[PDB]
Amino acid sequence: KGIFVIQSESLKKCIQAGKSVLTLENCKQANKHMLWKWVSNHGLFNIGGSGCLGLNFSAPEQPLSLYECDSTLVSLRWRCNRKMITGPLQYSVQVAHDNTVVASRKYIHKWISYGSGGGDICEYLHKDLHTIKGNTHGMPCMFPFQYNHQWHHECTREGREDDLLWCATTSRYERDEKWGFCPDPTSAEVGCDTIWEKDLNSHICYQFNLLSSLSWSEAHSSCQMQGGTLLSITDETEENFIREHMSSKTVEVWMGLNQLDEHAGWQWSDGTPLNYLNWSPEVNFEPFVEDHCGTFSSFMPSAWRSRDCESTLPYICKKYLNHIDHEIVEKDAWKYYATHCEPGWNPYNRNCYKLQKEEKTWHEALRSCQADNSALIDITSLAEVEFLVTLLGDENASETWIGLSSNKIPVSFEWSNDSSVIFTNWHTLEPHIFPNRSQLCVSAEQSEGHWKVKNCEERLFYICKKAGHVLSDAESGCQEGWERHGGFCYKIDTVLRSFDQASSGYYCPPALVTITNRFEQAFITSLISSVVKMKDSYFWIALQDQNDTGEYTWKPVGQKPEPVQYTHWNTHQPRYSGGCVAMRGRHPLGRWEVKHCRHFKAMSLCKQPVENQEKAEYEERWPFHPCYLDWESEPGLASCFKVFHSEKVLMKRTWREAEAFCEEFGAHLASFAHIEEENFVNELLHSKFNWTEERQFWIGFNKRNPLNAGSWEWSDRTPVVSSFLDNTYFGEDARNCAVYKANKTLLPLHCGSKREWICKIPRDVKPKIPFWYQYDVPWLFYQDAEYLFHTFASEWLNFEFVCSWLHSDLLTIHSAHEQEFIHSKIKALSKYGASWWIGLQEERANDEFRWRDGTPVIYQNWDTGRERTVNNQSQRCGFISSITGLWGSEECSVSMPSICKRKKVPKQHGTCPKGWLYFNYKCLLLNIPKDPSSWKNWTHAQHFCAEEGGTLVAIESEVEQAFITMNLFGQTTSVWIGLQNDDYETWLNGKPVVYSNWSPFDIINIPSHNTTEVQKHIPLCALLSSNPNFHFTGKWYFEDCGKEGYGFVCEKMQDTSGHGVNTSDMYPMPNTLEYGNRTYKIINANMTWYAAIKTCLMHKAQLVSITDQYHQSFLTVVLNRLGYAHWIGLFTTDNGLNFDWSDGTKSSFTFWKDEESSLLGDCVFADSNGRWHSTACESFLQGAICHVPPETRQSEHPELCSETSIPWIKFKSNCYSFSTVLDSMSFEAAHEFCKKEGSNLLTIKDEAENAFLLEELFAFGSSVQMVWLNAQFDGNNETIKWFDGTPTDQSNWGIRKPDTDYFKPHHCVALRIPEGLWQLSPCQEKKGFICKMEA
Ligand SMILES: *[C@@H]1O[C@H](CO)[C@@H](O[C@@H]2O[C@H](CO)[C@@H](O[C@@H]3O[C@H](CO)[C@@H](O)[C@H](O[C@H]4O[C@H](CO)[C@@H](O)[C@H](O)[C@@H]4O)[C@@H]3O)[C@H](O)[C@H]2NC(C)=O)[C@H](O)[C@H]1NC(C)=O
Ligand SMILES: *[C@@H]1O[C@H](CO[C@@H]2O[C@H](CO)[C@@H](O)[C@H](O[C@@H]3O[C@H](CO[C@H]4O[C@H](CO)[C@@H](O)[C@H](O)[C@@H]4O)[C@@H](O)[C@H](O)[C@@H]3O)[C@H]2NC(C)=O)[C@@H](O)[C@H](O)[C@H]1NC(C)=O
Ligand SMILES: *[C@@H]1O[C@H](CO)[C@@H](O[C@@H]2O[C@H](CO)[C@@H](O[C@@H]3O[C@H](CO)[C@@H](O)[C@H](O)[C@@H]3O)[C@H](O)[C@H]2NC(C)=O)[C@H](O)[C@H]1NC(C)=O
Ligand SMILES: *[C@@H]1O[C@H](CO)[C@@H](O[C@@H]2O[C@H](CO)[C@@H](O[C@@H]3O[C@H](CO)[C@@H](O)[C@H](O)[C@@H]3O)[C@H](O)[C@H]2NC(C)=O)[C@H](O)[C@H]1NC(C)=O
Ligand SMILES: *[C@@H]1O[C@H](CO)[C@@H](O)[C@H](O)[C@H]1NC(C)=O
Ligand SMILES: *[C@@H]1O[C@H](CO)[C@@H](O)[C@H](O)[C@H]1NC(C)=O
Ligand SMILES: *[C@@H]1O[C@H](CO)[C@@H](O)[C@H](O)[C@H]1NC(C)=O
Ligand SMILES: *[C@@H]1O[C@H](CO)[C@@H](O)[C@H](O)[C@H]1NC(C)=O
Ligand SMILES: *[C@@H]1O[C@H](CO)[C@@H](O)[C@H](O)[C@H]1NC(C)=O
Ligand SMILES: *[C@@H]1O[C@H](CO)[C@@H](O)[C@H](O)[C@H]1NC(C)=O
Ligand SMILES: *[C@@H]1O[C@H](CO)[C@@H](O)[C@H](O)[C@H]1NC(C)=O
Ligand SMILES: *[C@@H]1O[C@H](CO)[C@@H](O)[C@H](O)[C@H]1NC(C)=O
Ligand SMILES: *[C@@H]1O[C@H](CO)[C@@H](O)[C@H](O)[C@H]1NC(C)=O
């Protein structure tokens, strides 16, 4: 129970709010009245007050009061620096002269907790519980939430007949029904789905969290919170069990398998070893890419795949029920037993070992070990790995064969002895299965004991293990020490308590402990776990920062310059400089923490030294010249740095992209092992740049690995010395990477951002690119772009990056003429005459026609010899033949050569003829005929424009496109445009196509023809889509120039022979505007986002909500007229994940300026060109856009919408079920299922419901492709009708659809969910279905 009472540090009073504004009162029994808690949004929810502390930024001077956290009127966010309560814009709660808080920037003030006296108020900072299932796709609980006329701050019971705890995903349960069950480990009886009692005694339970699209990090978290763990596929038997026992056969789920540690190989998130593997080539293998997490599907093949962990997918949790003592798998694995052996052999704990240094094949080495009563080594515990690395400490001992190998095509790894596997230490990339060899054998490397597979025929050294028996009960190492380990002994005690302070000597004569390796850390963890006398204790460690510097370091024994090479910090633990390190005893055993040396209590640790004196440590000649002259560093520093201020010319880079760039030079994203390094890099930055903070640079500091304790780490393996924690502003889990700034400071960030960076390299530069082909760039002679022919063999999943580093990401073709030039050059006689890569990319088995450049593939030059080039999506990368130049697709890793390119070698207002619309120094006609007889084909409409004095529109810019779209609202007739398939890049008027709005699909998909075969004989003509679906609305495609059925837009510059009548539209600023079927108010005052919300509410309107591209287009013209930004009603309670509209309308429409712009803040505004931007809500902008809403009223029992049995989502007056979406099933079967359920198969009756569904189903992503629509296709008619007889008005097809495709047994129509189009399909296919009913 995290509730607390908050007291002023400087004044013995606390916040017992009371009515209206809160007040400072004595902590009398009113502590039993007013208490405080942290909730979903950072705000503080005052229990009893049933409120939520807010700050009115329009007038901060007013005393603070309690609001409803659903309120958008006031800023409710709060932040916690050291014992502060800090609001946005530097404000903070702070008592005025009077005893009432006036949160102000005036002066600092500090707060602490009553009761326990917690020195930090934020000891109970909120953590988000992800709901498992029941009405929502696994969102976090939103606290507090309004149940029946009352607020709740914790998961509750009342709502569900069943007694499991539940919560709401949205602030008000009554208004929105998105509830969900709450994680709980206690309710195992109903907490988990299926008990697989088949195991001997485990009674292992499984929870099949389908429907719960989550990132891997959140899935792992969720599974943990109930006491379970992400799925571990121990063996084929359990894999096949789950294969059948899961229900929705078409889903892909998270497992638990991962390679999140870039320095370690694939591993189960749980403690299970990775011995059984079912990798499938369905995913393409590359070592560098971000596919770090493992996905499993119950398809016919036994296949696992690699995905990006942030992707949202369902998952499965795994929990053993009998293992209460599971904290450590083995209890006595670390205790040393006095061992003896014969000459040549080295004794280790209770065993004999010997390394032969005789290169042998695996079979040869096994037979050699068998020559004696010995077998190749088997590793049972990390202690054996420690001994392995110690022995490989032999003079060369680079690698050794391990007594472990595979003997199956579906690989399962077993020892050379018929015994089970208990541990695995796979190297960074070496669980890699050589395609089909029957047996692959593992060798261990000397660096860390990392294992890697390879052909068993390889000749390598080998170590034979042998039995032994205890020599005696003596401990010759340190009889006085409590235990021995390796080359030291340990004498922990739970009596002496101060931080090593002793009258003489120390608590033990060798003083406090120092940790150099994870092996040592594990041993001491075992020690503490063995001697936990009283729970959650702490133990002192020699690491301290008493000479307050931030760079915590060991307390040095005599003249010892003891460095630090390993650390075990707790969650976001290395907070503040100064103090001493204490290691935790609570069940997260062994984690380190910082503590106060005069106030904290911890117990004594000891390290009896090596019985043989150690020699001198280092030579230290290396800083003579740490790196080549190319890189920068102090002479004397241990590493070198290089700052990358641009890409190609001035372009930035994502975090992982910059890291890969450092890697291809051999370096890492920079890291600070020392305050000296940090200061040196700051000084370098300020030597390079001005008195500016305009530049933010990437660094290695990151948090991308969540399976370990959530805490930051350097990508370079250097340990994190304390207090480099960028800021106390932690908890922003959405941000996972970090950036550096001048004045010695760091900022958390989202790794998806783009920035400049800096790489660090200790000793040796390894250029992989050498900046190839430094003068083969100039090719303007042929086109307007400069090309480059990369003759060096390279696969372009990576070479796209290097290609971008000077040019486009890859070459892309948009002209038969440029293709002729490319063929002429590529017709090279030498090895350069091989096939060549191009930017042509495939994203699915379908969707094989997108450039990685991002442009749609509008021009075709395929070779027709291989139209079946899919190879289960492996062949996804395009290439051109050297002999003909015809294209082809290939598996991307083949790494043939490639190419690159890059795109750089009187406006007076006037009169507008009648009927035309004057928009921007020009007039548009926008002829949309109402008569079929009046329709013109493109080659005719050109005549009309010419005779009228203009030409077909040339859409020069997004504002022109938006104007045309807004002047095309209700006319569902597409309209010609003035560009031709002959040249996608030049408008008919003769100027380049800089702007473009090509449709995502069907650009050349003429229904009456093949895509390509007859197209090459037919001219094609541009055409502006009038489709009412925002994915297509105002988009461009092509159609037969001779076709008819489409209007035309003529353009002609304004007639300047007279008044500049554009003033008639420029001058007026109508306070109210009408468009489509709604009315807008343009406010033009100085205000924040909250102020704009309040202003719209003080008006009768509400802050605008933009649900479609038509309204977005109108607002684009409006804002272009106004000339400056305005607020809009889009905001997010959570940082940059998913925004919501202030007025509560749901729509998937989004019009961001750029992908990263979504992340720059919490409240959204619109640019002068309409494009959206996120930003801090406290910013001040000179206007806003309100819209008048349609008024409606509600019933008394709409909460009837959902029962306790089924996940029913309420929308307006009807409920939809989405659980059935994944239940792939046939048409009539779905019909009958809904019928018997007491509902009807989905019916799209209005645009509001259409948009609501298109948004809601986006939560499942690619988990479903199509859904059945309850519409009958008439037999001898083209008509389509809902089961209720209502017309099919809402129907939509990207291009006008002929009925000629349905079979006599009528085809049945479904909804292509990712894009929203309709499509008739064979009626017996298996698809998802959605029931719907009234509330
Ligand atoms: C829209 O209205 C808001 C209303 O708040 C307005 O924001 C306010 O702007 C003023 C002016 O920038 C801020 O006042 C400043 O606050 C700082 C706080 O440290 C003071 O230091 C400033 O005084 C110093 O600087 C002055 C010259 O800049 C000197 O003359 C003076 O002697 C001091 O040296 C100054 O008072 C005010 O803080 C904000 N409001 C909030 C809540 O922060 C905003 O600017 C308006 N928008 C537009 C476009 O005008
Ligand atoms: C887009 O639509 C275009 C409109 O149709 C044309 O309209 C013109 C109006 O003046 C007509 O002149 C033109 O036909 C002319 O035909 C004469 C020869 O006359 C014979 O053929 C016509 C049909 O072409 C027939 O109606 C007569 O009775 C007679 O048998 C010819 O010498 C001229 O050059 C014109 O072609 C209409 N038809 C055509 C085909 O031009 C049309 O022009 C255009 O082709 C359409 N777009 C595409 C891609 O076909
Ligand atoms: C946050 O602070 C702002 C600014 O101090 C508050 O705005 C003010 O709210 C009052 C109402 O409490 C407004 O008074 C009303 O003005 C209208 C104007 O037409 C008048 O018709 C009413 O009879 C009444 O007098 C006041 O104008 C308004 N001032 C501004 C600059 O907007 C706001 O109420 C505060 N909100 C919260 C939740 O504390
Ligand atoms: C932190 O950043 C600043 C700016 O990027 C670094 O330079 C400092 O910049 C400020 C102006 O922003 C300078 O102040 C000016 O000083 C002159 C002195 O003649 C004065 O006439 C001006 O009116 C103004 O006050 C400041 O001097 C300057 N200091 C230095 C050392 O360059 C600053 O160095 C950065 N600090 C760190 C630790 O990186
Ligand atoms: C190990 O072998 C290398 C050559 O393979 C040799 O240079 C080196 O001196 C040997 N000893 C050690 C300790 O590396
Ligand atoms: C391991 O090898 C020994 C002989 O070295 C053998 O007796 C034993 O059975 C093997 N392990 C198992 C589980 O059988
Ligand atoms: C498959 O395994 C055999 C083992 O003899 C090996 O020669 C071959 O290179 C492997 N790969 C393929 C594609 O056959
Ligand atoms: C700081 O370091 C000096 C040695 O240079 C030492 O004598 C002194 O006690 C240290 N002070 C603290 C607070 O650690
Ligand atoms: C910094 O900018 C000022 C602008 O006045 C200029 O005088 C100075 O030379 C610049 N210095 C550097 C290092 O860019
Ligand atoms: C994969 O190949 C098989 C033939 O072995 C084919 O039946 C299947 O359709 C392919 N997969 C896809 C997604 O096309
Ligand atoms: C083109 O469409 C026709 C339709 O009859 C079909 O016969 C032919 O095989 C198709 N060719 C290609 C290359 O798609
Ligand atoms: C505008 O919306 C109202 C809503 O009741 C509807 O009755 C009216 O027909 C609509 N007008 C147009 C032109 O769509
Ligand atoms: C075709 O449509 C008409 C209504 O326009 C309807 O009466 C008739 O039954 C339909 N015929 C078939 C075969 O569906």
Author numbering: 38 to 942, 952 to 1381
From the paper:
Most instances of MN are associated with the presence of circulating autoantibodies against a podocyte cell surface receptor, phospholipase A2 receptor (PLA2R). The PLA2R autoantibodies primarily bind to a dominant epitope located within a 31-amino acid peptide in the cysteine-rich domain (CysR) of PLA2R. PLA2R is a member of the mannose receptor family, a five-protein subgroup of the C-type lectin superfamily comprising the mannose receptor, Endo180, DEC-205, PLA2R. and FcRY. All family members contain a homologous CysR domain, fibronectin type II (FnII) domain, multiple sequential CTLDs, and a short intracellular C-terminal tail.
We expressed and purified the soluble ECD of PLA2R (residues 21–1397, spanning the N-terminal CysR to the C-terminal CTLD8 region) and performed small-angle X-ray scattering (SAXS) and cryoEM structural analysis. For single-particle cryoEM data collection, PLA2R was buffer exchanged to pH 6.2, consistent with the more compact conformation. The structure of the PLA2R ECD was determined to a resolution of 3.4 Å. The PLA2R ECD domains pack tightly together, presenting a globular structure with dimensions of ∼80 × 80 × 100 Å. Each of the tightly packed PLA2R ECDs could be built from the N-terminal CysR to CTLD8 using mostly contiguous density. It was also possible to build the initial few sugar moieties of the N-linked glycans into the cryoEM density, highlighting the dense glycosylation of PLA2R. The domain arrangements, and therefore the interdomain interactions, are different from those previously reported. The key hydrophobic residues V and I within the VIQSES sequence are located within an accessible cleft on the CysR domain, while the SVLTLENC sequence is entirely surface exposed. Of the two constituents that comprise the epitope, VIQSES occupies a surface-accessible cleft, and SVLTLENC is entirely surface exposed on the CysR domain unaffected by compaction of the structure at lower pH. Interestingly, the arrangement of the domains CysR, CTLD1, CTLD7, and CTLD8 in this structure identifies a discrete immunogenic patch on PLA2R that induces autoantibody formation and is the target for autoantibody binding.
